């Protein structure tokens, strides 16, 4: 779910960034013909979009740091499982857990961390 939320937020922020670049061009145009009502309206819309995008940045970075915490938890758990066994079983358990997580076979992951 962290993955999905980050994907949706990045999509929305790409949309708003494209909007902002369009508004920058439009404001430069309105300013080149000294049309100040429309220029000021573009600048207002840019201000509002920047506020919304900053809120989106805050929430995206928060979820992203949580995602990093989760990834480190997973990797450190695989390492804690491997570190419990000495010798050739270590990398065996490590690669087994990596393959059991790349296939999202969580039950097999815990099976190989328990006895395997």
């Amino acid at each position: 779910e962290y993955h999905s939320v980050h994907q949706k937020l990045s999509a929305d922020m790409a949309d708003n960034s494209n909007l902002i670049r369009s508004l920058l061009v439009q404001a430069e145009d309105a300013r080149l013909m000294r049309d100040m009502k429309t220029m000021k309206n573009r600048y207002k819309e840019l201000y509002d979009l920047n506020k919304d995008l900053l809120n989106g940045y805050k929430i995206r970075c928060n979820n992203h740091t949580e995602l990093l915490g989760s990834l480190k938890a997973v990797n450190q758990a695989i390492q804690r499982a491997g570190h419990l066994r000495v010798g050739k079983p270590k990398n065996q358990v490590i690669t087994a857990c990596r393959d059991a997580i790349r296939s999202n076979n969580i039950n097999m992951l815990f099976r190989i961390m328990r006895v395997g």
Binding site: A14, L24, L53, G56, H64, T65
Partner: protein, 764 residues
């Protein structure tokens, strides 16, 4: 003839008919055993037509039976238990019917008859969409058929006996169905772009043998088995062409850049390859060995089914059938006809008619080198004006529009008359009133109409434009007030008559020493001189003198013509001001320079805002967190500065416009005084009014000083000056914003003094 489908026996096949794929079939349905082919065509009406072309004629149509219900599919194969003779199977929505086209001869070629005898029929408890046939399993001498219902169900009939029916798994729309014998498998292209192959025994026992996610859905699918060296399943997608192996993966694929309609892999010529034939919705056939285009030829119609058969002692004839009814046999045209204009002798140039017309047009050419009345009436009373416009022909696309002045405002501005029939009258009515504080430069008003005259060359008519002028009453933007005594600015107009009573000229302004206050606050004083013949006008602002001075002069002329006197002048001895005038020019130019400075400041602020915004954008694109509050608190400051500068530029634009409107009145009065001071004719006054009163407002590329200075330089250069060093050094015409008003003022003073020295104005 190169790259065209050269025609053979061809015919249109009905009266607004409807055909699809599976309608056109081509085999030996008559069981003649010879080897020729007979064109079979079902319809979506019922017209089962069988032809044997003999190149149209009337012996071709073997029969044209009409069954009640539409004919979805037509096929030819061993559809009967005992005999090994080809029969004709016809599939309607809820019926399967296997006939037997038996032809018995007559003593004469047009006496032989053909009958289709119903050999059996199966009722369908579901609505079919298409079907296929083959040797289901490995049974020999049989062609048992599988019919696909439109709701995804394969009902398999072994001939004369409904065998079974299996629901295809996961299908919403029906797709193209084919049968492979090298693998004994049905092959479909389901709605989720999945080419799926099922094994026949798994279906009979009921799952999916294999699947392949092609990127689209398929129109047709042809498992071609003329070659046994290597079976291959061809697929015509709605955008791509595929040939797939028997295990499931893509043997090869081509990305058509057109919309295909039908395809047919006929026999191959090389070793391993397979020639194939695909028809566009651009009505063109493509011959492709593997994926290489070996030929391409223009069909007459967009084919709905193509076949290639041997018809009347000719192998490989292409037989196309559309959904309109165009059925056509054809071959490929291989004649690269020469590209040469035809050498006709009958067809010659009718030089006499053409030359009369050419002399007419050349006459108009050599001649080019060598009807609506508009009248405006102002009521004597926000005064209401009425414009009456009349024609003498049937004018069209008429538009009337009124332009008064910046301060003055109209309640209605545009009137559109789409068509007015000849010698007719239209009448519009609007009302004009002052809105603002300063007084307008002139109380004139203009009504311009634009129409189109319908002519013989152009039925939309030449565009033409005509205009009329009206003069608003002084009592719109003025009222009587207390006459001051000593004002700052003054000018005295002397006349050669008796000093007239002020209560006569201005009767709604009552007093032989009058005072005027304008809507906005300006105040002017008019003194009739009692010992001299002159009058004096005064006010603290040099601009406000113009409206009253104009009205004094105009109403003096009108009064002395109403009385009957003719001799009358307004000499204005003295000196043209040229010093309270230059102050308004300097004020205007200062406002212009302020505006340019503010525009540069705003340019810089906008560039900075753009840079910071792009930094923030790049920050937003990065996935990792990063502190940026410094950046957005720089953006907020830059944006508030941008808003400040925008409001300042608006303020300067309005101030500059007011300064321009006051300068217009100033220059009006100055031209009036120069015309009274040197006895200028009407044309010499119009030249001044064109040089000194150029445009309506200042724009960011053209302004007042540049234009008036260019015009004055040209007039001084080609009318007054004689020396050439001066004509080239001082008197220079350029159209960019100046650096200071020094040259404009030098030229205005020089213009005044050289008018005083006898010089007169011309044009060339």
């Amino acid at each position: 003839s190169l790259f065209k489908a050269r025609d053979w026996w061809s015919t249109v096949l009905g009266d607004k008919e409807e055909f699809d794929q599976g309608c056109l079939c081509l085999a030996d349905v008559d069981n003649t055993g010879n080897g020729q082919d007979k064109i079979i065509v079902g319809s979506f009406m019922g017209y089962l037509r069988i032809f044997n072309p003999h190149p149209a004629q009337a012996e071709d149509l073997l029969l044209e039976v009409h069954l009640r219900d539409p004919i979805l599919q037509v096929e030819v194969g061993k559809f009967v238990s005992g005999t090994e003779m080809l029969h004709l199977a016809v599939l309607h929505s809820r019926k399967l019917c296997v006939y037997s086209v038996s032809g018995t001869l007559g003593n004469v070629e047009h006496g032989n008859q053909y009958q289709i005898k119903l050999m059996y029929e199966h009722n369908l408890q579901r609505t079919a969409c298409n079907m296929t046939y083959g040797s289901f399993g490995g049974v020999k001498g049989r062609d048992l058929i599988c019919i696909q219902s439109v709701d995804g169900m394969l009902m398999v009939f072994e001939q004369e006996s409904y065998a079974f029916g299996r629901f295809l798994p996961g299908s919403l729309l029906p797709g193209p169905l084919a049968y492979s014998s090298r693998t004994d498998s049905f092959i479909t292209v389901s709605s989720c772009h999945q080419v799926e192959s099922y094994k026949y025994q798994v279906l009979a026992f009921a799952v999916v043998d294999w699947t392949l996610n092609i990127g689209e859905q398929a129109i047709d699918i042809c498992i071609v088995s003329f070659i046994q060296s290597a079976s291959s399943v061809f697929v015509l997608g709605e955008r791509n062409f595929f040939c797939l192996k028997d295990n499931g993966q893509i043997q090869f694929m081509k990305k058509l850049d057109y919309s295909p309609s039908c395809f047919l892999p006929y026999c191959s010529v090389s070793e391993g390859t397979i020639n194939t034939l695909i028809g566009n919705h651009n009505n063109m056939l493509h011959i492709y060995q593997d994926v290489t285009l070996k030929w391409a030829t223009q069909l007459p119609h967009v084919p709905v089914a193509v076949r290639v058969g041997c018809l009347h002692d000719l192998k490989g004839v292409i037989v196309t059938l559309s959904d309109d009814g165009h059925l056509q046999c054809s071959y490929l045209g291989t004649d690269p006809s020469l590209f040469q204009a035809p050498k006709v002798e009958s067809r010659e140039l009718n030089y006499d008619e053409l030359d009369m017309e050419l002399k007419e047009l050349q006459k108009v050419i050599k001649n080019v080198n060598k009807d609506l009345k508009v009248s405006a009436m102002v009521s004597p009373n926000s005064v209401t004006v009425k414009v009456t416009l009349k024609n003498r022909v049937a004018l069209q696309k008429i538009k009337l529009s009124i332009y008064v002045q910046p301060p003055l405002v109209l309640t209605g501005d545009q009137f559109t008359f789409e068509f007015m029939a000849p010698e007719m009258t239209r009448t519009v009515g609007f009302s004009v009133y002052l809105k603002g504080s300063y007084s307008p430069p002139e109380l004139e008003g203009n009504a311009v109409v634009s129409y189109s005259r319908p002519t013989e060359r152009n039925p939309d008519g030449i565009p033409r434009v005509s205009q009329c002028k009206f003069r608003l009453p002084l009592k719109l933007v003025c009222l009587p007030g207390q006459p001051s005594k000593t004002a700052s600015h003054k000018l005295t107009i002397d006349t050669n008559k008796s000093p007239v009573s002020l209560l006569s000229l201005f009767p709604g302004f009552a007093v032989n020493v009058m005072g005027f206050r304008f809507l906005g606050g300006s105040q002017v004083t008019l003194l009739a001189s009692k010992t001299s013949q002159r009058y004096r006008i005064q006010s603290e602002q040099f601009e406000d003198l113009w409206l009253i001075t104009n009205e004094l002069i105009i109403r003096l002329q009108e009064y002395f013509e109403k009385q009957g006197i003719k001799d009358f002048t307004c000499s204005f001895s003295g000196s043209v001001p040229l010093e309270e005038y230059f102050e308004l020019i300097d004020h205007h130019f200062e406002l212009r320079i302020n505006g340019e400075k503010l525009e540069e400041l705003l340019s810089e602020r906008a560039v900075q805002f753009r840079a910071i915004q792009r930094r923030l954008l790049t920050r937003f694109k990065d996935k990792t967190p990063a502190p940026l509050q410094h950046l957005d608190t720089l953006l907020d400051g830059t944006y508030k500065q941008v808003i400040a500068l925008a409001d300042a530029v608006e303020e300067n634009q309005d101030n500059l416009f007011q300064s321009f409107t006051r300068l217009k009145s100033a220059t009006h009065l100055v031209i009036l005084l120069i015309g009274l001071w040197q006895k200028l004719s009407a044309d010499q006054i119009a030249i001044l009014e064109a040089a000194f009163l150029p445009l309506q407002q200042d724009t960011q590329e053209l302004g007042w000083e540049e234009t008036v200075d260019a015009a004055l330089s040209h007039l001084l250069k080609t009318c007054l000056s004689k020396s050439s060093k001066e004509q080239a050094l001082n008197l220079n015409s350029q159209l960019g914003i100046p650096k200071d008003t020094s040259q404009l003022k030098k030229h205005i003073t020089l213009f005044c003094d050289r008018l005083a020295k006898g010089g007169r104005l011309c044009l060339s």
